[PDB]
Structures are given as C-alpha cells and as structure tokens.
Design a protein around this ligand. Sequence first.
Ligand SMILES: NS(=O)(=O)c1ccc(NC(=O)NS(=O)(=O)c2ccc(Cl)cc2)cn1
Ligand SMILES: [Zn+2]
Length: 256
Amino acid sequence: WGYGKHNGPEHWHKDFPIAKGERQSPVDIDTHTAKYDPSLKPLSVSYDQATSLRILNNGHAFNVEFDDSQDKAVLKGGPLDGTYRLIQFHFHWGSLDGQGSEHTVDKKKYAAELHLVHWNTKYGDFGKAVQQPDGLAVLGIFLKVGSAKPGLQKVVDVLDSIKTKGKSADFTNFDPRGLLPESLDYWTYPGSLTTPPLLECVTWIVLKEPISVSSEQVLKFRKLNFNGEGEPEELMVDNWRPAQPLKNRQIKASFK
Ligand SMILES: NS(=O)(=O)c1ccc(NC(=O)NS(=O)(=O)c2ccc(Cl)cc2)cn1
Ligand SMILES: [Zn+2]
C-alpha cells in the first residue's frame, strides 16, 4: 500500500476491508452541522516532561517518537476518559499548498496536518490499544503556509539525514509544545487510523486554529523520499487519505 495510482487510498480496501467501515477517518468537518457540546471539558495537554527519542522515515511519513514507558507527555480531558500517552507525531502534506491535510473544514484542504498520536494507558501498550474502540486519541492540527513556525525548525533541519525509507536519526530534547496553536478549541468524533491497518480505535480531536509554517519549511517536507536509498527517487508528497463518509456519526464542537 501507498499513495500512488496503483496502490493508493482507493485500493486499500482489498487488503484492509475495514477501509469501507462504519467509522473511517479522515472526514470533512461541516462547521455548520457540528454541534456544540457544552459538557465537553477543556483539553489538557501536558507535554512538560516529554522525552523525544528518534525520528524515522517509515516510507509513508516521518515519525518523531517519544518514550511512552511512563506518563511523561499525556493528553487528558476533552472527550477522553482516562490518560492517553504520546507515542509519536507525524504529518501528512501535499505537493502544492492547496492540498495535504486529511481532515477538511467545510471542504477546505490545508497544506498539511500534524497528528500527535496517543494511547489509552488502561490498555498497557500501543498494540493492545489499537484493538479497542477507545484505544487511541489523535490530536490533529492543520498547517497553513504563511509565517514560519519556529518550533518546527528543528524537525525541518534533520530531514536531510532521514531522506529515504528506513533511515532514522537521534532526536532528543524536542519540545512538542512548540507545534501547538494558541487556542485549544476543537472538534471531536470517533474514527480510525488514516493509514493501514485503518483500525477503528481513534477518538479524533481536531483543533480549529491552524498553525502557520513557511513556504521554505513545507518545501523541505517535500524533499523527503518514499523510496529507500539506492532506489528510484519518488518524492514523499501527497501522503494524505481523502475524506471518508461520515455515516452514523456526529461531530461535536468544544466551542460555539
Ligand atoms: N491516524 S494516523 O495518526 O494517521 C495513524 C495511522 C496509522 C498508524 N499506524 C501505525 O501506527 N502502524 S504500526 O506502527 O505499523 C502498527 C503498530 C502496531 C499495531 Cl497493533 C498496528 C500498527 C498510526 N497513526
Ligand atoms: Zn496521521
């Protein structure tokens, strides 16, 4: 599977039949149809003790990985019951500034989307959590092209060292608080992983406020490769799944 003509999102269902399931992600967020749920709590993002370890090009995106063997960087509150530990973040992005995000807002596509992936500590580890309907919480943040995001630059500058699939680099002391927007207002709905295995284990929390990144920053994302070293160059771009049917779901808003 991948994002090409012959192995892209429209093909995934053949190996991953859940691709046509009842709670697939991403979705379009119709802002007028989302309903304010006054009982939704403010989100608690507690990243002060985060321990980043490594950055990896996995052939479909790059993951910044964290130590999730203790409650160091956690997400709580909002729609969530209990404590969700940060395991990794990654992005999805386009070949052009007018596409790249997975979620859309009133059909608007952003240039990219950041996913901070967390797992519910009552399930003990990530592999068990993905087998549960409330196993994961993914915090989604839109990126638009404008001013640079200073907190992103340390990521941008290491990408040369992980150009190709399977490459990793040490990536300690990275503070993911530098990727957050000012407001934590969000939409939330039950969904899935957006890449195979497409498991229906995610509480999605998608922030309303995008972060701005510069054209130079996103250009560096687009220099990455899907291929391994010594293989024909295929630029890592358009690694996003399009919006999937909402089916029997309501998107809730934390704000009016
Ligand atoms: N929804 S998402 O944030 O883009 C997202 C999609 C897919 C994944 N997939 C993922 O972690 N795959 S994996 O590491 O190979 C893996 C690991 C363990 C299991 Cl049990 C299943 C899959 C993570 N986040
Ligand atoms: Zn993702």
